RNA sequence: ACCUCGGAGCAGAACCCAACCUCCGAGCAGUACAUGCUAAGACUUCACCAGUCAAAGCGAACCUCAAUUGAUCCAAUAACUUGACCAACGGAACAAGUUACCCUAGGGAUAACAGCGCAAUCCUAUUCUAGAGUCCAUAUCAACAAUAGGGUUUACGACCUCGAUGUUGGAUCAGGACAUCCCGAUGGUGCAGCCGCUAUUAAAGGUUCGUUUGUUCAACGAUUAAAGUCCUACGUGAUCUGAGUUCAGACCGGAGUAAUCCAGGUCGGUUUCUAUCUACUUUAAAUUCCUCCCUGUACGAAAGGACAAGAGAAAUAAGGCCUACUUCACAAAGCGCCUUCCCCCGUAAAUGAUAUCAUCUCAACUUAGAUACCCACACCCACCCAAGAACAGGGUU
RNA sequence: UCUCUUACUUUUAACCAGUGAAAUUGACCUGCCCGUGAAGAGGCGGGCAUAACACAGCAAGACGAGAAGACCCUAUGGAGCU
RNA sequence: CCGAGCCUGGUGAUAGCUGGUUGUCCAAGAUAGAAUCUUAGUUCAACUUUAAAUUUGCCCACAGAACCAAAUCCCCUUGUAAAUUUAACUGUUAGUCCAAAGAGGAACAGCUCUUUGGACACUAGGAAAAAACCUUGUAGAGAGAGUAAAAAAUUUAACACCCAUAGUAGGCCUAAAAGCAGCCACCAAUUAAGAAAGCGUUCAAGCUCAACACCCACUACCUAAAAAAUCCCAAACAUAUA
RNA sequence: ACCCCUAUACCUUCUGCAUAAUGAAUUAACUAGAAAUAACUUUGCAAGGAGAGCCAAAGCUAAGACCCCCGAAACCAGACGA
């Protein structure tokens, strides 16, 4: 079965909280061919609003995104039509969570 | 220093439009003036050609904006010319 | 190679260049912010309780006393009819310095317990503390009026 | 000790490079002198229908010129001097 | 597979920030693009060689006017990593015949009409 | 196995686009009998050949299908027309095996050996904690799975070499790594002791002889402290062998009409080189076993049974010498004799802050923790020598 | 034969005298380690070493010399046999 | 040198195969493919060269290209100067890496196969040496100058103290299963303790946690390896204004 | 003069050779591009041109300028050899 970055691979729910869970999971999830967390409700909109807060403020004045999509220096050249819309946070298989 | 040079506006290479490169080398003894140097001869045919490829550009921009103000002002008088010819009767 | 690879596959060095530009760059706080600069109400209506009722007060040293003995001390004391209250420092020390016993603060430091009365019968709250000898008697208070141990074994005989 | 196998820049196993500081100085220069690329182009003085025949002219009569040239591509004169300057090789004194 | 790029319209929209930055008037726009190539056609495509050589940008270092109009634009546009543009600025105004045998066109990108070799 | 033609994906949107790439088909059928003639303009399978559409006009009337196919010559026929699974499908009119008896021109454009790339396979370590271990994950072993490393196997690729990079084992000499078989030090134990198991550190020193087999291996006999794992062009054939393996002879079984062949067995079968260049050709600290006593002590219910300290006796290795023995005899040798000396680091403790306890400390701190050899130097014609290839050296009173 | 090799004689050898070849040879003022590289370097990179020159010996290297590979493939190249 | 003697002649046999091919200087000049007893070759095309004739050739504005992503086709301006046709032929048609989209293989290979684009087979500087990465191209002399690309950063694990009676060996099941084999419920006294979160017991018994008090205050950086074979490999240096 | 700095012999072959791929000790001599159909250029004459034949809706006649060397195993004929 193929499985991209940022999909849940099992759910789970029911009259518990996150650490219960989240020692088993973290067990499993350290198991798994692939780089994976044991992530809550609430731990995963932390995730998403601390990569919106570090993209908004930023003190780069040069991003990926920028560059590769007005082309500057040429980087398409040596850049994948699909980094326009990875916007340099995926290489291969893998995903950076630190790029923004 | 090119980059202070350019920051004064003296160019970046020394060699570059100043007067140390521009002004003649020589002279004779009792003052007459040497005949010109080649590379001044040709630095001056080239902006020349330089100046005259401005003007030129400079003013078919102009005459073709004109013109465009002249096709505007044809189009607009003929949208305006819109009197009827004959009147209208009939239920009126 | 292909695109997709199991081991993480060698840039091109000039798409590295670009990475190591593009890197993100957190926000530089100026003078560094670290630098820069329930109970209670239960616990306040029961000692209002103990101490506009119950005028005999005795403060003595919570000494660890198993629990037998705890319940074996405390049975004696409430066969001759004195109570023992446990009311926590935090709650209490301000409501002496705000309820003028003061003078009485500067004692319950400290493990403390209360010995508490309606009935002055200091006679055998004296006669258990000599048959345990590990306990001291700090201090209180008879109608109103501080008073050290050699006041309440004088008050006593 | 430590051999790259193969060649070091080809291949599935390459030799490390990093980025160093003036490399990276250098790419962000580059960068600025291209943003203020972009903002010169990103200012227009005409737009497309102003400027829809305004160099048709030079651009025919150039192209005229070239025309010319080509057309005059033809073979050169030939002259009884140059021939009979060629009889000059047996000029002696006397 | 490698391509031609198409390049958006949102990078070649300006800003104000952008206008004080480099400070150039919204209208009245600059009449003349002083072009320079700054970098070679080597390792780059063939389309990007031809339009440096339609251009006339063979010879690096060498600057080139061209009219500030939108089919120039877009062919600086495709080749604008190659290249730097300056806005060509006349103090003096426009060279005259009688003027014409004595310009500069000066690191500022300022054509002078008139050049004495001499101190102010 | 495939060879020609067509459809779909790869090849997402003008065209085109390969693989011994993934699927599906074709070598016709049915209708008509104007399925007659002719003629602008076009398309085109990347060439040509071939193929495709068609206005108008004459004459009539009032084709479906995706591929559904074959050139020239020649043959048949009065003519029109018609002829190949020419399927190796741009088709030679008509021709098979075998060669180790082989030959030639070449090819590292292409295999076998070796190197190199890679790590599927192989090997190791760690993470996770199911499970086994009376209980107990972690004394010991370990599933599913994850992370990392190695380059010893079997492969895969075809990058140097086919105007030669000689080959398996064995002899000889070995260089190195440590992932340690023994000897050294230490931690844990389901460690009472002896024996063990597991882990850390240690590459100075060592790691046997035989029967069968060409064997590497493997089985067995006898030991030993141990009989290590590997790399070195599967180290080493201008140092050796040629038992095996893949030249020419022959036999057995089988295959084939036969020639002949077998990734089957068996008997036999030429191993050249006078060293030009690099490199090198005398760098003195030795380990191990056994015996006694300690001691039948510690330990242990008993049975069993040490570690230190010390003494002796050997063996090997290195260096050397002939008094005797022995080969022998103005001498060279071993089978004989003499000598052989330092540590080594894992960890265990004390004081004591960060963190007023404690804490062995990437806290400051304390403890366990070499000498020898050589050394002078135009007597030299010549002679002798325990010195020596020549040269050199020692003696000549 | 070997454990396990030793001693002696002859040839060879080394030196002196006379005579005097051959294969080989791009030029060489011809070192070591690690790395690199047409993937195994005396000649390239980093380091180390380094007065010059004979004579005897060795065989690890010069992918050493010899023989336009005796195995494999190719050629619309041959030949022998059935 | 007998798988068929030797010599002469046909014979300068033939060789899609190897080797070689001799003065100076300049210029243009790099590989879509189809057939083939063909893939070690050749013919046509394609590219390339020369000489002529003519007029458009590249870049491209909007609109236009099908139902079941990057882009392309077409294309007036515009910037430029090439393009087509005619005539005459040779030679290339045994291809490597890098980036990207894929296919095969192991989401192995300096592996194989297509496509787009670079570079190499031509120069110079850099990444150590260096084909293919980056910078840069049009040629000479100079004991002038400005620049391009261009030098790797990182060093990790301290965690509390004190305290604990009891309704009860809650009920059922079991020989007992007592907070802790399995089930229902989960109340309730002391100031404050779960009908018990780990251990531990055949079951018991025991000892830790959550709870009182206590008090400065939970102090809380949330992170993580190592191996091979001749000999480690520039020397080094934290602090004088880009 | 060396010492300093820079510098990976040549040819062939190949995607790519300092390559440890080929050839070469060195000198002297010898040793390898032959031609038609057409085209192009320069003359002569010109609806004709060429010293019969041939070509001709500007052609015809003349000239110039373009196509290597070595090498097999083999096949056949006639001799000579027990
Ligand atoms: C060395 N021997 C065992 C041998 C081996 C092979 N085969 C190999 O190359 C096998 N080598 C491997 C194992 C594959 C690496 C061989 O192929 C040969 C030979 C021998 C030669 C003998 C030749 C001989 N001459 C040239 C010395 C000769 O005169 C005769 C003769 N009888 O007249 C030959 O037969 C001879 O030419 C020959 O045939 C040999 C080989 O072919
Ligand atoms: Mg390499
Ligand atoms: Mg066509
Ligand atoms: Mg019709
Ligand atoms: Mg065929
Ligand atoms: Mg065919
Ligand atoms: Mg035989
Ligand atoms: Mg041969
Ligand atoms: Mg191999
Ligand atoms: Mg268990
Ligand atoms: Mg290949
Ligand atoms: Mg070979
Ligand atoms: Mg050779
Ligand atoms: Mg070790
Ligand atoms: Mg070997
Ligand atoms: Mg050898
Ligand atoms: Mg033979
Ligand atoms: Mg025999
Ligand atoms: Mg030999
Ligand atoms: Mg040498
Ligand atoms: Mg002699
Ligand atoms: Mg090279
Ligand atoms: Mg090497
Ligand atoms: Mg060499
Ligand atoms: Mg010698
Ligand atoms: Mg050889
Ligand atoms: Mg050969
Ligand atoms: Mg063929
Ligand atoms: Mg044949
Ligand atoms: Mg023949
Ligand atoms: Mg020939
Ligand atoms: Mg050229
Ligand atoms: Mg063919
Ligand atoms: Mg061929
Ligand atoms: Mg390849
Ligand atoms: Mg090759
Ligand atoms: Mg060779
Ligand atoms: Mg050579
Ligand atoms: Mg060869
Ligand atoms: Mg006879």
Redesign the interface.
């Known amino acids: 079965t193929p499985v991209k970055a940022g999909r849940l691979v099992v759910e789970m729910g029911g009259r518990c909280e996150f650490e219960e869970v989240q020692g088993f999971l973290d067990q499993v999830a350290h198991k798994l061919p692939f780089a994976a967390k044991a992530v809550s409700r609430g731990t995963l909109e932390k995730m998403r609003k601390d990569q919106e807060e570090r993209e908004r403020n930023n003190q780069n004045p040069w991003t990926f995104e920028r560059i590769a999509t007005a082309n500057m220096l040429g980087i398409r050249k040596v850049l994948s039509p699909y980094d326009l819309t990875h916007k340099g946070k995926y290489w291969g298989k893998f995903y950076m969570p630190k790029r923004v | 220093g090119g980059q202070w040079?350019?920051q004064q506006?003296?160019?970046?290479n020394p060699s570059?439009?100043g007067?140390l490169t521009?002004?003649p080398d020589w002279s004779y003894a009792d003052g007459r003036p040497a005949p010109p140097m080649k590379g001044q001869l040709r630095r001056?045919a080239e902006?020349?050609t330089?100046?005259?490829?401005?003007?030129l550009?400079?003013q078919?921009?102009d005459?073709?904006?004109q013109?465009?103000q002249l096709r505007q002002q044809k189009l607009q008088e003929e949208q305006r010319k819109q009197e009827n010819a004959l009147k209208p009767k009939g239920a009126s | 190679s292909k695109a997709v690879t199991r081991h993480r596959r060698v840039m091109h060095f000039q798409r590295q260049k670009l990475m190591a530009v593009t890197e993100y760059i957190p926000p530089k706080p100026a003078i560094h912010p670290s630098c820069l600069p329930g109970l209670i109400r239960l616990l306040r209506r029961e000692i209002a309780a103990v101490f506009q009722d119950n005028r005999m007060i005795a403060v003595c040293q919570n000494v660890a006393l198993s629990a037998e003995d705890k319940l074996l001390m405390r049975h004696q004391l409430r066969k001759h009819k004195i109570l023992m209250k446990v009311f926590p420092n935090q709650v209490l020390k301000p409501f002496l310095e705000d309820s003028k016993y003061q003078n009485l603060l500067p004692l319950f430091v400290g493990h403390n317990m209360l010995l508490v009365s309606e009935e002055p019968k200091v006679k055998e709250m004296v006669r258990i503390l000599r048959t345990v000898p590990f306990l001291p008697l700090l201090g209180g208070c008879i109608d109103d009026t501080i008073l050290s141990r050699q006041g309440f074994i004088n008050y006593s005989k | 000790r430590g051999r790259i196998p193969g060649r070091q820049w080809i291949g599935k196993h390459r030799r490390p490079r990093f980025v160093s500081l003036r490399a990276k100085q250098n790419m962000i220069r580059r960068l600025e002198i291209e943003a203020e690329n972009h903002y010169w182009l990103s200012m227009p003085?005409?737009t497309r229908?102003?400027?829809?025949?305004?160099?048709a002219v030079?651009r025919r009569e150039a192209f005229e010129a070239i025309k010319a040239a080509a057309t005059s591509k033809f073979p050169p004169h030939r002259f009884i001097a140059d021939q009979l300057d060629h009889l000059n090789v047996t000029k002696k004194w006397s | 597979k490698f391509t031609r790029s198409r390049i958006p319209e949102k990078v070649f929209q300006a800003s104000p920030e952008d206008h004080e930055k480099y400070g150039g008037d919204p209208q009245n726009p600059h009449?003349?693009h002083i072009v320079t190539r700054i970098k070679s056609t080597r390792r780059r495509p063939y389309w990007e060689k031809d339009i440096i050589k339609m251009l006339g940008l063979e010879k690096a270092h060498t600057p080139q006017?061209?009219?500030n109009?939108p089919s120039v634009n877009a062919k600086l546009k495709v080749v604008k990593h190659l290249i730097r543009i300056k806005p060509?600025k006349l103090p003096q105004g426009?060279?005259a015949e009688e003027n014409?045998?004595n310009?500069?066109?000066?690191?500022?990108g300022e054509?002078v009409?008139q050049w004495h070799?001499?101190p102010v």
């Open positions: 040079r350019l506006g003296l160019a970046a570059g439009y007067p521009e002004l001056k902006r020349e330089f100046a005259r490829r401005v003007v550009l400079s078919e921009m005459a073709g904006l013109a465009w | 003085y005409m229908e102003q400027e829809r025949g305004h160099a030079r | 009449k003349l006017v061209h009219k109009i060509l426009l060279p014409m045998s310009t500069c066109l000066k690191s500022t054509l009409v070799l001499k």
